[PDB]
Design a binder for this molecule. Structure first.
Ligand code: EF2
Ligand code: CA
Ligand code: CL
Ligand code: CL
Ligand code: CL
Ligand code: CL
Ligand code: CL
Ligand code: CL
Ligand code: CL
Ligand code: NI
Ligand code: ZN
Length: 106
């Protein structure tokens, strides 16, 4: 059974369970933004359906050695998470907010 992560707002296909990545040994990280809100961040090696906004930034990065850019759903513009770059093994990956996705069957 393929298990698809869809944009919770609009239903667009974004990623799948098979594309989870154990970043630092763990494909689901618990992180705090600077306002103190807690996110569960799924780590994916690949994703579809995403528009990236801005130049990379390293500030506040939750993943050492990686800079982020904001990832929006291309269809509806929901803020789904971030793309990470500038690392090694892998160079890049996606960190997507669990509450902003919905996991279900194909
Ligand atoms: O790895 C990341 C991605 C971006 C994220 N981030 C936020 O969630 C945020 C909210 C408010 C102002 C500034 C930021 C910031 O860098 C953050 O804290 N770390
Ligand atoms: Ca975890
Ligand atoms: Cl899958
Ligand atoms: Cl990590
Ligand atoms: Cl964690
Ligand atoms: Cl944190
Ligand atoms: Cl969350
Ligand atoms: Cl952000
Ligand atoms: Cl949103
Ligand atoms: Ni895993
Ligand atoms: Zn969407």
């Amino acid at each position: 059974g393929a298990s698809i992560f869809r944009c919770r707002q609009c239903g667009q296909t974004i990623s799948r369970r098979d594309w989870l990545l154990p970043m630092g040994g763990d494909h689901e990280h618990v992180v705090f933004n600077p306002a103190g809100m807690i996110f569960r961040v799924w780590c994916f090696s690949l994703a579809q359906g995403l528009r990236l906004i801005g130049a990379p930034s390293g500030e506040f990065s939750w993943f050492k050695g990686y800079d982020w850019t904001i990832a929006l759903c291309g269809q509806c513009g929901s803020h789904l998470g971030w793309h990470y770059e500038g690392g090694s093994q892998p160079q890049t990956f996606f960190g997507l907010i669990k509450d902003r996705l919905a996991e279900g069957p194909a």
